[PDB]
């Protein structure tokens, strides 16, 4: 499930992807961050 | 899959939030969906 959203901005509407996308990635590291080591190894 | 497109639209950047944001919400329901009863206990 490889996916890559290249940077595409025009003006003020570009800020949408920047924040939106940025949130997605952060969501992964977060959940997958503790959900991967919730009880250590 | 995407069809019916106008010859000139002043919102090509809007599609960013639509997809980006839409993905975020879906990410929650997904993870929180199985992570709510994963392996039962």
From Swiss-Prot, chains A, B:
Post-translational modifications: Autophosphorylates. Phosphorylated on tyrosine upon binding and activation by EFNA1. These phosphorylated residues are critical for recruitment of VAV2 and VAV3 and PI3-kinase p85 subunit which transduce downstream signaling to activate RAC1 GTPase and cell migration.
Compartments reported by the entry: Cell membrane; Cell projection, Ruffle membrane; Cell projection, Lamellipodium membrane; Cell junction, Focal adhesion
Transmembrane region(s): 16-36
Tissues expressing the protein: Expressed in brain and glioma tissue and glioma cell lines (at protein level). Expressed most highly in tissues that contain a high proportion of epithelial cells, e.g. skin, intestine, lung, and ovary.
Induction: Up-regulated by UV irradiation via a TP53-independent, MAPK-dependent mechanism.
Subunit architecture: Homodimer. Interacts with SLA. Interacts (phosphorylated form) with VAV2, VAV3 and PI3-kinase p85 subunit (PIK3R1, PIK3R2 or PIK3R3); critical for the EFNA1-induced activation of RAC1 which stimulates cell migration. Interacts with INPPL1; regulates activated EPHA2 endocytosis and degradation. Interacts (inactivated form) with PTK2/FAK1 and interacts (EFNA1 ligand-activated form) with PTPN11; regulates integrin-mediated adhesion. Interacts with ARHGEF16, DOCK4 and ELMO2; mediates ligand-independent activation of RAC1 which stimulates cell migration.
Sequence similarity: Belongs to the protein kinase superfamily. Tyr protein kinase family. Ephrin receptor subfamily.
Disease implicated: Cataract 6, multiple types: An opacification of the crystalline lens of the eye that frequently results in visual impairment or blindness. Opacities vary in morphology, are often confined to a portion of the lens, and may be static or progressive. CTRCT6 includes posterior polar and age-related cortical cataracts, among others. Posterior polar cataract is a subcapsular opacity, usually disk-shaped, located at the back of the lens. Age-related cortical cataract is a developmental punctate opacity restricted to the cortex.
Summary of the function given for this chain in its UniProt record: Receptor tyrosine kinase which binds promiscuously membrane-bound ephrin-A family ligands residing on adjacent cells, leading to contact-dependent bidirectional signaling into neighboring cells. The signaling pathway downstream of the receptor is referred to as forward signaling while the signaling pathway downstream of the ephrin ligand is referred to as reverse signaling. Activated by the ligand ephrin-A1/EFNA1 regulates migration, integrin-mediated adhesion, proliferation and differentiation of cells. (Microbial infection) Acts as a receptor for hepatitis C virus (HCV) in hepatocytes and facilitates its cell entry. Mediates HCV entry by promoting the formation of the CD81-CLDN1 receptor complexes that are essential for HCV entry and by enhancing membrane fusion of cells expressing HCV envelope glycoproteins.
Protein known as: Ephrin type-A receptor 2
Source species of the chain: Homo sapiens
Lineage: Eukaryota, Metazoa, Chordata, Craniata, Vertebrata
Gene name of this polypeptide: EPHA2
């Amino acid at each position: 499930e490889f996916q890559t959203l290249s940077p595409e901005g025009s003006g003020n509407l570009a800020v949408i992807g920047g924040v939106a996308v940025g949130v997605v990635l952060l969501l992964v590291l977060a959940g997958v961050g503790f959900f991967i080591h919730r009880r250590r190894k």
